[PDB]
Amino acid sequence: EPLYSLRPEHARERLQDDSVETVTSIEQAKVEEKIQEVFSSYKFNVPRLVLQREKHFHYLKRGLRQLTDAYECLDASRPTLCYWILHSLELLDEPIPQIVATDVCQFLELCQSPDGGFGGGPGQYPHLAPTTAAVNALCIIGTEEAYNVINREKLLQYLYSLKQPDGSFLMHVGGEVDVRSAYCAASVASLTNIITPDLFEGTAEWIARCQNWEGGIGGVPGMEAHGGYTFCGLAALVILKKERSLNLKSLLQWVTSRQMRFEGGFQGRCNKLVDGCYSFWQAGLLPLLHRALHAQGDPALSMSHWMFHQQALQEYILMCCQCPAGGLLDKPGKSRDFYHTCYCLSGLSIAQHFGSGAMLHDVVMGVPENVLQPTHPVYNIGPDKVIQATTHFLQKPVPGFE
Amino acid sequence: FLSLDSPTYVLYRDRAEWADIDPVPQNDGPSPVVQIIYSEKFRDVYDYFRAVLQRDERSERAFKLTRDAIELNAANYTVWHFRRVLLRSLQKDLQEEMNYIIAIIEEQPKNYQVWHHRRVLVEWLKDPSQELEFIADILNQDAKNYHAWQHRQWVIQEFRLWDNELQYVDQLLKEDVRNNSVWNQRHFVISNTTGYSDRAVLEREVQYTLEMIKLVPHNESAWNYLKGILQDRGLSRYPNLLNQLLDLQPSHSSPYLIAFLVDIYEDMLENQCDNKEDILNKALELCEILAKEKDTIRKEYWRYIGRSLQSKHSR
Numbered sequence: 166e167p168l169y170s171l172r173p174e175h176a177r178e179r180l181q182d183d184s185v186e187t188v189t190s191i192e193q194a195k196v197e198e199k200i201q202e203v204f205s206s207y208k209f210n211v212p213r214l215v216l217q218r219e220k221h222f223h224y225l226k227r228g229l230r231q232l233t234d235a236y237e238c239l240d241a242s243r244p245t246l247c248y249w250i251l252h253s254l255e256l257l258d259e260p261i262p263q264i265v266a267t268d269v270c271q272f273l274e275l276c277q278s279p280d281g282g283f284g285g286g287p288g289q290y291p292h293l294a295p296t297t298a299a300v301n302a303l304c305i306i307g308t309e310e311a312y313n314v315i316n317r318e319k320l321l322q323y324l325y326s327l328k329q330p331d332g333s334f335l336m337h338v339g340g341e342v343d344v345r346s347a348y349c350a351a352s353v354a355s356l357t358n359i360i361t362p363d364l365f366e367g368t369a370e371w372i373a374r375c376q377n378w379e380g381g382i383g384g385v386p387g388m389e390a391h392g393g394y395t396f397c398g399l400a401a402l403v404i405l406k407k408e409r410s411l412n413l414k415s416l417l418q419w420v421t422s423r424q425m426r427f428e429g430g431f432q433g434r435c436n437k438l439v440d441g442c443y444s445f446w447q448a449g450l451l452p453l454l455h456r457a458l459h460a461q462g463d464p465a466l467s468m469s470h471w472m473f474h475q476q477a478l479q480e481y482i483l484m485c486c487q488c489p490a491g492g493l494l495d496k497p498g499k500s501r502d503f504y505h506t507c508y509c510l511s512g513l514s515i516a517q518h519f520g521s522g523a524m525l526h527d528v529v530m531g532v533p534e535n536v537l538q539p540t541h542p543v544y545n546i547g548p549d550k551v552i553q554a555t556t557h558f559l560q561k562p563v564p565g566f567e
Numbered sequence: 568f569l570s571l572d573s574p575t576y577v578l579y580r581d582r583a584e585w586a587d588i589d590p591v592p593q594n595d596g597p598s599p600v601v602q603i604i605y606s607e608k609f610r611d612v613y614d615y616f617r618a619v620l621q622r623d624e625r626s627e628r629a630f631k632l633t634r635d636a637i638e639l640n641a642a643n644y645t646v647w648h649f650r651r652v653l654l655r656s657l658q659k660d661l662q663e664e665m666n667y668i669i670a671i672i673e674e675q676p677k678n679y680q681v682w683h684h685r686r687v688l689v690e691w692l693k694d695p696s697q698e699l700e701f702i703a704d705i706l707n708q709d710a711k712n713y714h715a716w717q718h719r720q721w722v723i724q725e726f727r728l729w730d731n732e733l734q735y736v737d738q739l740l741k742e743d744v745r746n747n748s749v750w751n752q753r754h755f756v757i758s759n760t761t762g763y764s765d766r767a768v769l770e771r772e773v774q775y776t777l778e779m780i781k782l783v784p785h786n787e788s789a790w791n792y793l794k795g796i797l798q799d800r801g802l803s804r805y806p807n808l809l810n811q812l813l814d815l816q817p818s819h820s821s822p823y824l825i826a827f828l829v830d831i832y833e834d835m836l837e838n839q840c841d842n843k844e845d846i847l848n849k850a851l852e853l854c855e856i857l858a859k860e861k862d863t864i865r866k867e868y869w870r871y872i873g874r875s876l877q878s879k880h881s882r
């Protein structure tokens with residue numbers, strides 16, 4: 166009787182509108198309507214939960230190499246596609262062949278701008294989003310060929326070129342500012358060992374001005390809290406080792422409230438809709454918080470589980486987010502894509518794997534072949550790859566230095 | 568000029584007025600990854616785009632071309648960059664450009680690059696006159712569009728246009744009291760105008776939020792706002808509050824009510840009040856109710872709050 170979303174008491178988690186209908190309530194009721202079908206189907210005239218690995222693999226394999234014109238609108242996000250596909254192959258535990266690794270490398274090299282960073286495609290101008298994605302990808306490959314693609318001197322200049330007086334960073338030259346760009350600078354700067362004393366001056370204070378009355382963080386000061394900006398906020402501070410800047414208690418109250426009592430998934434902001442990729446952006450905050458309350462002695466932390474219903478998140482991802490053709494979705498009756506394939510999987514991995522000091526405790530719903538490789542919650546690549554790269558770049562000096 | 572959906576559309580490589588220029592094919596190298604098999608229109612346009620970008624041709628035909636390249640892929644930030652270089656070079660009529668960017672936003676309201684472009688025009692013109700009304704039309708179609716709200720906050724802060732914003736907030740709250748973007752905007756206006764220390768203001772606000780909570784006990788947005796105004800100062804500073812909530816409970820009792828009460832007891836224990844070991848129990852009784860019946864999705868969060876109170880408020 167052992168599946169949380171199919172228990173009879175679970176019918177009570179349905180929306181109560183208090184007889185006052187609004188757009189928000191009508192839409193929430195429609196999703197809960199669909200999700201109910203999916204659940205009452207799995208029970209019909211018992212069966213298990215399987216992660217369709219072979220199907221997801223074929224989809225990924227093929228995409229890494231070639232794409233129809235439906236994908237024209239991702240023509241300035243190619244390194245980002247690389248990262249989405251390699252991360253999902255890495256999670257599903259799929260060795261990358263060497264001629265594929267090699268092709269990825271030479272490609273990212275053509276995306277690299279002569280003044281530093283990577284652009285969305287060969288000969289495009291550089292931008293922080295494809296820059297983090299390219300670096301992450303090179304790390305997933307984890308070889309010396311890949312590590313040497315990155316021009317660390319030019320990376321650091323590029324980053325100085327984006328840094329603002331008030332602590333923030335532009336996404337690209339003449340571009341806009343938001344918390345994503347700080348995360349990106351922190352992620353790339355710290356894996357490649359290029360942090361100088363002043364690079365992040367003002368940055369952690371800028372980030373905290375972004376934490377708002379709700380507990381979460383918004384894209385820039387004043388803005389509503391959102392899972393994507395919050396994760397980047399927290400994670401960038403964990404990198405800078407300034408988690409203390411934020412009010413971690415209100416941040417915790419906020420994220421835990423973003424798990425949906427019926428669906429099991431996460432919404433990205435309050436009173437909006439469940440969405441598969443928030444399985445990483447929201448639920449990956451719990452590991453970050455766990456390690457932060459712990460480095461302040463919190464003695465009330467658990468040592469089996471993160472502070473969300475891991476079981477119920479897994480049930481959402483496995484029953485509602487899988488495409489029978491391969492790949493994963495926002496929610497039922499959407500169509501798949503590589504971004505959701507990547508982040509639904511990253512979130513399933515996180516809901517599977519607890520680790521804290523010397524504690525480890527896994528929780529794998531459905532068949533045991535469902536287990537994924539663990540992901541590092543700051544960088545969202547594998548913990549080994551993170552170690553291997555940091556170690557390797559630590560051998561060279563920060564530039565403008567020795 | 569010659570729109571991409573016109574029956575008469577002609578690839579650039581067949582246009583006479585482009586005959587002097589050799590197109591520049593993309594360099595994906597010998598054996599590419601994430602290779603996109605672009606349509607014929609798309610690849611033709613971008614082949615010419617690369618030729619002008621590379622020559623740095625600051626020309627009228629280069630300008631009309633960027634429009635096409637954007638229509639095919641509005642997220643190519645490199646193309647938007649080049650278009651702004653041409654508005655400076657060719658000294659184009661920036662008001663014409665405002666009309667262009669309005670149409671595109673209506674067509675693709677969730678694209679970053681289109682809003683960034685609009686803002687740069689406004690910085691250039693120093694002219695906010697159309698902004699609030701334009702934003703209001705988009706918000707009429709998607710009341711939660713994050714980028715629209717972001718642009719609204721930027722326009723208001725920048726050109727100090729605070730005077731009608733609260734009435735706007737109030738109109739929208741009436742339309743959908745669950746729109747958390749509006750509750751956030753309410754707070755944005757108030758905190759930058761009057762502040763929340765004017766006790767007259769902090770009263771009207773708290774009064775109002777309870778009035779909404781009464782109509783819709785299960786609307787989380789209001790509960791988060793109530794908490795977020797009072798939490799600054801400390802909830803035990805407001806003794807009437809505990810009892811006023813306890814009065815809502817037999818009828819209007821969401822799981823948010825229960826959790827607020829826990830927040831109040833939490834603040835009382837923290838301020839050394841009377842009945843320490845009594846109140847520490849009424850709290851733990853709710854933690855267990857929530858974790859174990861009324862809010863189990865957060866079972867782990869509440870078991871942790873329970874174990875925090877004990878570990879802090881004992882001997």
Ligand SMILES: C/C(=C\COP(=O)(O)OP(=O)(O)O)CC/C=C(\C)CNC(=O)CCCC[C@@H]1SC[C@@H]2NC(=O)N[C@@H]21
Pocket residue numbers: 245248293294295297298301345348349391392393394397432433434437438440504677711712713714
């Ligand atoms: C405008 C917005 C959400 C829009 O919400 P919406 O209304 O469309 O949907 P919702 O109702 O809010 O769920 C902001 C939210 C931001 C995110 C969902 C995503 N956060 C990021 O993309 C982080 C950027 C860091 C760049 C790196 S590169 C490798 C990796 N891959 C990736 O996609 N991003 C990262």
Ligand SMILES: [Zn+2]
Pocket residue numbers: 440441442443495505
């Ligand atoms: Zn999504």
